[PDB]
Design an enzyme around this catalytic site. Structure first.
Site, PDB file in Angstrom:
ATOM      1  N   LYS A  95       0.720  -1.220  -0.390  1.00 40.44           N
ATOM      2  CA  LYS A  95       0.345  -0.145   0.001  1.00 40.44           C
ATOM      3  C   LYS A  95       1.019   1.169   0.284  1.00 40.44           C
ATOM      4  O   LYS A  95       2.020   1.464  -0.907  1.00 40.44           O
ATOM      5  CB  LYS A  95      -0.835   0.026   1.611  1.00 40.44           C
ATOM      6  CG  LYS A  95      -2.150  -1.581   0.883  1.00 40.44           C
ATOM      7  CD  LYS A  95      -2.788  -1.311   2.311  1.00 40.44           C
ATOM      8  CE  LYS A  95      -1.902  -1.819   3.326  1.00 40.44           C
ATOM      9  NZ  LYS A  95      -2.987  -3.025   4.508  1.00 40.44           N
ATOM     10  N   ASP A 109      -5.114  -8.625   9.443  1.00 38.60           N
ATOM     11  CA  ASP A 109      -6.381  -7.921   9.437  1.00 38.60           C
ATOM     12  C   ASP A 109      -7.405  -9.180   8.570  1.00 38.60           C
ATOM     13  O   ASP A 109      -8.469  -9.526   9.810  1.00 38.60           O
ATOM     14  CB  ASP A 109      -6.667  -6.748   8.939  1.00 38.60           C
ATOM     15  CG  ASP A 109      -6.217  -6.668   7.867  1.00 38.60           C
ATOM     16  OD1 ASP A 109      -4.841  -7.029   7.246  1.00 38.60           O
ATOM     17  OD2 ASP A 109      -7.002  -5.207   6.910  1.00 38.60           O
TER      18      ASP A 109
END
Ligand SMILES: OC[C@H]1O[C@@H](O)[C@H](O)[C@@H](O)[C@@H]1O
Length: 455
Positions: free
Chosen positions: A162, A197
């Site tokens: 990211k 996550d």
């Protein structure tokens, strides 16, 4: 408008994901799952052992903290668990936008941001969330990046994805780094679990639904986790779990296959990114990138087909200026004048105004991009189901989370529809896609609760 239409048509064709291509991708995914489980370096799919061999059941009780570092947001929370009937009695949380400079700065600075925010949150403890005098706070740490796990509560960072680039942090233990930061602010916390996550989301879903077998994140980034048989993991034999199961963080964002419908805009996005050659699948699926693919198509239309006139609007040249929430808004517009599309384009790009023809192309572009991302997500899930050998009444539930799936209705609806298409009439009813919660964060706390040192 001829040249604009030619670009649009070519883009539409190149992005195509007919059912046959989705089958090819799913199969490629399943092959790579075997390869990544066979050996540590044998696949684009890292297939990381989580050291989670047991998921929450619902009987967990007590007070637990959770910490969630994502690509753009940071979240701290605490919950009161009351068992099977009451479940989550009470939850308090705060969310902070991560300052962009922290994403590419130093390691200590990032963990200091995390620990300082946590310390402020802990200071607000009162009433129900007051800490019992003879106990310490127990914390689940959700860390949304690839980690080489060494135990349930330890592991080192493999690489950033990211918007992140802190080379200093690569190969360092994430829990150790957090611990130092906690000590710098004089905060006392027991870190009971470190999870991706996806793994957090999986635990959150299983907590409510025993049939949950996998979790998928469709947000800023994309990834999936699932429950694999321990015996089916040749590369690993640390624990010998009584459950015979082990949650795997696939890191499917890094998946690449020749079957992926890539375009010149995807290639230029990748080539100019922070991590060229990495996260290829994620770059055509996730929220960080969907808007950027749109910007790059529009930029070419502006430069080579006079889309915005004789001059390319300067704002169109700024990378990531167009974000996925803009796309969601525009895609959702059904007005005859496309007034929402016109308003959003004018606000973001600072152009005088837009004709209806321009607005039609933009919304068409949004649909092409979103539909490709959604259909490839479905292929990935189908790939997981194939691996589990579930492609009777062995119901399988996929727990979903992330801003794309939660807020982008056209995207989420397309993904589910594509998945059921892949499953077909017979196998359709055996698979269900569920919910969201704030599962990434909450799941880490529920895992901590499973490993609490208090009765
Ligand atoms: O947040 C979803 C995913 O984003 C990806 O960029 C990260 O590499 C994964 O660790 C994470 O699960």
């Amino acid at each position: 408008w001829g040249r604009v239409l030619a670009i649009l048509k070519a883009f539409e064709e190149d992005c195509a994901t007919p059912i046959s291509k989705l089958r090819q991708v799913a199969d490629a995914m399943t092959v790579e799952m075997h390869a990544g489980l066979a050996s540590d370096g044998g696949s684009k799919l890292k297939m990381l052992i989580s050291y989670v061999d047991n998921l929450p059941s619902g009987d967990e009780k007590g007070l637990f903290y959770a910490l969630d570092l994502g690509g753009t947001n940071f979240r701290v929370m605490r919950v009161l668990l009351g068992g099977k009937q009451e479940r989550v009695v009470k939850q308090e949380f705060e969310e902070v936008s991560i300052p962009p400079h922290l994403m590419t700065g130093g390691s200590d600075e990032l963990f200091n941001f995390i620990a300082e925010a946590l310390a402020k949150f802990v200071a607000t403890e009162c009433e129900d969330f007051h800490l019992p005098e003879g106990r310490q706070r127990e914390l689940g740490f959700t860390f949304s990046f690839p980690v080489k796990q060494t135990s349930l509560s330890s592991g080192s960072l493999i690489k950033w994805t990211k918007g992140f680039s802190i080379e200093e942090a690569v190969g360092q233990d994430v829990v150790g780094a957090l611990n130092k930061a906690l000590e710098r602010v004089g905060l006392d916390m027991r870190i009971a679990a470190l999870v991706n996550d996806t793994v957090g989301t999986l635990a959150g879903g299983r907590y409510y639904n025993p049939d949950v077998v996998a979790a998928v994140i469709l947000g800023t980034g994309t990834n999936a986790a699932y429950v694999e048989r321990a015996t089916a993991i040749p590369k690993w034999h640390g624990l010998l779990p009584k459950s015979g199961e082990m949650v795997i963080n696939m890191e499917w964002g890094n998946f690449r296959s020749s079957h992926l419908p890539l375009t010149e805009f995807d290639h230029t996005l990748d080539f100019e990114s922070l991590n060229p050659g990495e996260q290829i699948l994620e770059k055509i699926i996730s929220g960080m990138y969907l808007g950027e693919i749109l910007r790059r198509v529009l930029l070419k239309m502006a430069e080579d087909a006079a889309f915005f006139g004789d001059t390319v609007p300067s704002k169109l040249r700024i990378p990531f200026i167009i974000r996925t929430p803009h796309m969601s808004a525009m895609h959702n517009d059904t007005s005859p004048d496309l007034k929402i599309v016109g308003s959003k384009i004018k606000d973001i790009l600072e152009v005088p105004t837009t004709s209806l023809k321009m607005r039609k192309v933009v919304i068409s572009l949004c649909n092409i991009i979103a539909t490709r991302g959604a259909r490839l997500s479905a292929a990935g899930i189908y790939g997981i189901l194939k691996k589990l050998g579930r492609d009777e009444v062995q119901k399988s539930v996929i727990a979903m989370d992330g801003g794309l799936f939660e807020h982008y209705t056209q995207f989420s609806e397309c993904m589910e529809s594509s998945l059921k298409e892949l499953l077909g009439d017979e196998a359709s009813g055996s698979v269900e896609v569920t919910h969201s919660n704030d599962g990434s964060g909450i799941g880490a706390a529920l895992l901590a609760a499973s490993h609490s040192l208090y009765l």
